C-alpha cells in the first residue's frame, strides 16, 4: 500500500532543491515523509531543562510531502513510479519502466 | 489475528492470575507512585496479561 | 429584604427532582423533552 517505505532512496520531484537524493528516515501519518538532507530548517531552540539544554540555532530535517518525492532507479538514473504485483498478501513493489522488483 | 496465546491455554490459571495481580501489579503500583522508570510500559503489560488470564478463565470454566 | 428564593435541597428534590418527575406521566414527558433537546442537566436535583 505504501509506495514510499521506511528505507528507500528517493529523489525529490518538487520543492526546495529537486535534484537532491536522500534516504527516508521516518514516515508520518499525515502524508508527509522525513528524508535526510532535503528540507533544512534552522530552528531557534530555547534553553530548557532536561532535553535541549544548551539551546542554539539547530539545523534539522523538516517534513516533505510524500507526493513531492519519487523513488530512484539504480539501473536507470531517473525517478520511476511504483506498482505492486504478486499473488499473495506480500505484494512486491515493481519499478515501472523496468518491471523489476525493488 | 495478531497475538497467539497458546501459552496461556493450560489448567489452573488461578495461580498465574494471583502472580500477575498480587505482588506484581501491587509492587508496580507502589514503585510507580514512588517513582520508577520502566513501569509505564510494565503496568500496561501486566494489565493486558491479567485480561488474557481472566478471558481464558471465562472460556474454560474447569481450569 | 426577604427574597423569592429561600433555598432548601429537600424541598428542591421533592418538587423539581428526578423521582418527582418520574412519578407523574407529565413529568416523564418533561424528562423526555429535556432528553430530546439534549440537556446535560435533565434535573436540577443532581
Amino acid at each position: 500500500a505504501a509506495k514510499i517505505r521506511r528505507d528507500d532512496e528517493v529523489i525529490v520531484l518538487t520543492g526546495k532543491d529537486k535534484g537532491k537524493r536522500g534516504k527516508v528516515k521516518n514516515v508520518l501519518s499525515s502524508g508527509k515523509v522525513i528524508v535526510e538532507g532535503i528540507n533544512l530548517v534552522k530552528k531557534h531552540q530555547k534553553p530548557v531543562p532536561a532535553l535541549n539544554q544548551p539551546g542554539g540555532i539547530v539545523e534539522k530535517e523538516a517534513a516533505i510531502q510524500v507526493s513531492n518525492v519519487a523513488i530512484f532507479n539504480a539501473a536507470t538514473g531517473k525517478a520511476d513510479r511504483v506498482g505492486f504485483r504478486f499473488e499473495d498478501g506480500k505484494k512486491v513493489r515493481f519499478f515501472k519502466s523496468n518491471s523489476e522488483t525493488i | 489475528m495478531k497475538a497467539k496465546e497458546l501459552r496461556e491455554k493450560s489448567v489452573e490459571e488461578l495461580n498465574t492470575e494471583l502472580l500477575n495481580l498480587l505482588r506484581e501489579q501491587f509492587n508496580l503500583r507502589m514503585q510507580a507512585a514512588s517513582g520508577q522508570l520502566q513501569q509505564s510500559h510494565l503496568l500496561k503489560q501486566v494489565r493486558r496479561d491479567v485480561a488474557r488470564v481472566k478471558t481464558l478463565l471465562n472460556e474454560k470454566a474447569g481450569a | 429584604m426577604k427574597r423569592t428564593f429561600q433555598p432548601s435541597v429537600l424541598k428542591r428534590n421533592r418538587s423539581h427532582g428526578f423521582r418527582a418527575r418520574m412519578a407523574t406521566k407529565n413529568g416523564r414527558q418533561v424528562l423526555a423533552r429535556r432528553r430530546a433537546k439534549g440537556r446535560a442537566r435533565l434535573t436540577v436535583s443532581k
Partner: protein
C-alpha cells in the same frame, strides 16, 4: 485454598508522602491512599497481608476532588479515600 486475596487490591498509593504523613509516621501511623469502596476491615487485612506489619486501627476519610481547572474549561479531579493506619506495635516503618 487461600481466602479473597484478589479483593486486596484496595491499597493504591504507598504514601500520600507529605508533612502530615511523615510526622504521623514519626508518631505511629502510615498514611495511605486506598480505593473508594474500601472498608476499614479490608484496609486492615490488606496492610497486614501485603506488608508484614500487624496493625492496630485504621481511620479513613474521603478527600473530595478539587476543581483545579481554568475559567474557559472547568473540570474536577477525582475523589479519593485516605487511610491513617495505626501501627503502635511491630511497625517496620
Amino acid at each position: 485454598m487461600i481466602r479473597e486475596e484478589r479483593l486486596l487490591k484496595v491499597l493504591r498509593a504507598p504514601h500520600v508522602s507529605e508533612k502530615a504523613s511523615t510526622a504521623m509516621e514519626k508518631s505511629n501511623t502510615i498514611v495511605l491512599k486506598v480505593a473508594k469502596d474500601a472498608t476499614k476491615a479490608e484496609i486492615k487485612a490488606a496492610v497486614q497481608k501485603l506488608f508484614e506489619v500487624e496493625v492496630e486501627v485504621v481511620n479513613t476519610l474521603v478527600v473530595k476532588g478539587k476543581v483545579k481547572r481554568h475559567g474557559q474549561r472547568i473540570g474536577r479531579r477525582s475523589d479519593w479515600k485516605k487511610a491513617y493506619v495505626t501501627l503502635k506495635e511491630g511497625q517496620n516503618l
